[PDB]
Amino acid sequence: DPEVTLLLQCPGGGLPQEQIQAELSPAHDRRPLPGGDEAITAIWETRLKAQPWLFDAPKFRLHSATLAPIGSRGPQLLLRLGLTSYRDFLGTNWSSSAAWLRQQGATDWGDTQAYLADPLGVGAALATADDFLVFLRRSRQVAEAPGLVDVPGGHPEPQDLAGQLVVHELFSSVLQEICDEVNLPLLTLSQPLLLGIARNETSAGRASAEFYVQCSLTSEQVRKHYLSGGPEAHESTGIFFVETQNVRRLPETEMWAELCPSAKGAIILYNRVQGSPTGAALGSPALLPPL
């Protein structure tokens, strides 16, 4: 799967909020472009003169993520984060010249991402009470991954001593994206666990944090809540469910070619971190069938 690379696989079946530290620093920002950020401004002007109802928004930038030695006490993950924007994304990662910026970054800074906005996404492996994962169909009329299958998520917007507020906004935002798009009550959702971080190589390497969230509703109740919002209550054009039993072999199915890269990330990390049992009981042949 060339379109997705794993940057981080979390231990212990996934990390809760209380085990993560963030360092939010201007040292973690995008570097100014070699010929100046005028190139970004020019692409933005062109875009607004065709779609003048568009608006900029701030975004978190992922610089890097360092895991503690496995089995250790105390904080287990440090997220190094800067600030970017939708405007910077359109002028770098989404640009036709994104590959040239990656090569220049290797040359100038020894870092393929040095000149890229790299806004941090969030996604969820959302499981039902009757043991299905939730999938959404994208419109065939949007610019990114039209007509492809996605999981719930988005790109959160800003507002250890400012760090803990940043980790809280990241975990909060995955729940908020589930409530906005699936139309679920917040009280049917578990506190999220961070499974890992996945890179979209089709979008010049921008990263998404992938979370596990459990819902107390069955698949039939989740469907009712989704549909009862009506066409204007969601961006997606349909919802569907795959048994967790069948998610194990999803990369061998015809569905795999229809999944956008970030949803592939979420499924690979669910299979490695929540699936793949380590103990004698769940690892027994009757409960973990060979092949």
Ligand X SMILES: CC(C)(CO)NC(=O)c1cccc(Cl)c1
Q: Which residues are annotated as a binding site?
A: 55, 86, 138, 143, 150, 155, 157, 177, 181, 262
Q: Record the tokens describing residue 71, joined without a space.
A: 């089995």
Helix axes 219-227, 163-182, angle to 10 degrees: 80
Candidates 60, 89, 171, 241; binder of ligand X (CB under 6 A) is 89
| CB neighbourhood size of 200 (10 A) | 22
| Whole-angstrom distance, CA of residue 197 vs CA of residue 157 | 18
- The label of the residue with tokens 């009329």 reads 141
Residue closer to ligand X by CB (options 86, 211) is: 86
Number of H helices and number of E strands within the chain? 8, 11
| DSSP labels, 79-105 | EEEEEEEHHHHHHTTTSTTHHHHHHHH
Binding mask 111-140 for ligand X (x = CB under 6 A): --------x---------------------
**Min dist. Cβ of residue 111 to ligand X (A):** 20
Tell me how long the chain is: 291
Question: Which DSSP letter does residue 284 get?
Answer: S
**Which residue, 23 or 88, has its beta carbon nearer to ligand X?**
88
Longest dimension (CA), the chain: 63
Q: Residue 86 or 212: which CB sits closer to ligand X?
A: 86
Which residue reads 């010249």 in tokens?
97
Q: How far is the CB of 160 from ligand X (least distance, A)?
A: 25
Q: Which neighbouring-strand residues pair with 289? A: none
| Residue 12 or 146 having the CB closest to ligand X | 146
Q: How far is the CB of 117 from ligand X (least distance, A)?
A: 7
We find the least distance from the C-beta atom of residue 37 to ligand X, in angstroms, to be 17
Contact between 155 and ligand X by CB under 6 A: the answer reads yes
Looking at residue 55, the DSSP 8-state letter turns out to be -
Q: Which lies closer to ligand X via its Cβ, residue 19 or residue 262?
A: 262
Q: Considering beta carbons, is residue 157 or 160 the nearer one to ligand X? A: 157
91 versus 196: smaller Cβ distance to ligand X: 91
Closest-approach residue to ligand X (CB): 119
Query: Nearest distance from residue 5's CB to ligand X, in Å?
Result: 18
Residues forming the annotated binding site for substrate? 55, 86, 138, 143, 150, 155, 157, 262
- Residues annotated within a binding site for Mg(2+): 177, 181
- Dihedral over alpha carbons 150, 171, 274, 237 (to 10 degrees): -20
Site string for ligand X, 217-236 (x = CB under 6 A): --------------------
Number of amino acids touching ligand X (CB under 6 A): 6
Label residues 40-72 b or e (16+ Cβ within 10 Å = b): beeebeeeeeeeeeeeeebbbbbbbbeeeeeee
Rounded least distance, CB 51 to ligand X, Å: 10
**Shortest CA distance to 192 belongs to which of 214, 167, 165?**
214
**Residues engaged in binding ligand X (CB under 6 A):** 59, 86, 89, 119, 144, 155
